[PDB]
Design a protein around this ligand. Structure first.
Ligand SMILES: OCc1ccc2c(c1)-c1n[nH]c(-c3ccc(-c4ccc(O)cc4)cc3)c1C2
Length: 263
């Protein structure tokens, strides 16, 4: 079949460009570029809540990463500033985020930069974890390696990453998911960084929930946030127990609208 390998670059997405197949019209995302690790980790991934990797090509000095096109864009653009989004939408997005993080941790991979800018949505609004540029293997041959590298985005990083030389990988991703949940329900970030010098972080540890952003969040999802945003990473809730939380299993959202007629 001629010209089936030809792709037209039509527009910029983030450099990330939208590529359309000349024959089939299939839309994919092409990342034009550390890189050796990013490609190797992407080759390991296959999950409905993780951005698909189709392959790569090296044209001299420029690397082309052929990745899944998510038409719904970033989760970031679904959060209304100072408001957030309806609680049933946030719960569905957090469910899908947990599925992706369970998968990644299961094959021994930590994302290390979970934030709404890296959580993409497909045509049916399904969440997909993207950007494995900061990702690393924390478990090899069923042996866990403790991390020591400073990775992430300060409002989403766990406090152990700033206070300890070494730390476990999994509680760091759990913490960033908790800040993502906060952003979805309150439309604002609680602190600039989780340090004692940050007044907003100090007030949370002092349980001053009468202040923003916590005053906008209902008691049921707030009780879960009280279990995730725990300073001690050893005392912090694990994903198996997040799945047992009362709000996590609270019926709130209906299914996708489905065409129906009467009489
Ligand atoms: O306007 C809609 C919109 C806005 C922004 C983006 C999209 C779509 C889109 N579709 N796909 C992507 C995209 C962007 C980045 C990745 C990516 C980057 C690095 C990786 O290692 C793995 C995945 C994968 C897909 C985007 C950004």
């Amino acid at each position: 079949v001629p010209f089936v390998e030809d792709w037209d670059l039509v527009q910029t997405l983030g450099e990330v460009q939208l590529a359309v197949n000349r024959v089939t019209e299939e839309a994919v995302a092409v990342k034009i570029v550390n890189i050796k690790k990013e490609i190797c980790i992407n080759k390991m991934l296959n999950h409905e809540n993780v951005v698909k990797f189709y392959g790569h090509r090296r044209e001299g000095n420029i690397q082309y990463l052929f990745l899944e096109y998510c038409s719904g864009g970033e989760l970031f653009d679904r959060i209304e500033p100072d408001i957030g989004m309806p609680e049933p939408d946030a719960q569905r997005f957090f469910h899908q985020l947990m599925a992706g993080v369970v998968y990644l941790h299961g094959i021994g991979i930590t994302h290390r930069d979970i934030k709404p800018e890296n959580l993409l949505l497909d045509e049916r609004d399904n969440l997909k974890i993207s950007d494995f540029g900061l990702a690393t293997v924390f478990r090899y041959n069923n042996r866990e390696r403790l991390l020591n590298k400073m990775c992430g985005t300060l409002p989403y990083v766990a406090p152990e990453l700033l206070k300890r030389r070494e730390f476990h990988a999994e509680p760091v991703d759990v913490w960033s998911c908790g800040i993502v949940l906060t952003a979805m329900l309150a439309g604002e970030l609680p602190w600039d960084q989780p340090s004692d010098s940050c007044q907003e972080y100090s007030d949370w540890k002092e349980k001053k929930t009468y202040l923003n952003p916590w005053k906008k969040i209902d008691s049921a999802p707030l009780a879960l946030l009280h279990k995730i945003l725990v300073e001690n990473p050893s005392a912090r809730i694990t994903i198996p127990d997040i799945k047992k939380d009362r709000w996590y299993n609270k019926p709130l959202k209906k299914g996708a609208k489905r065409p129906r007629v009467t009489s």
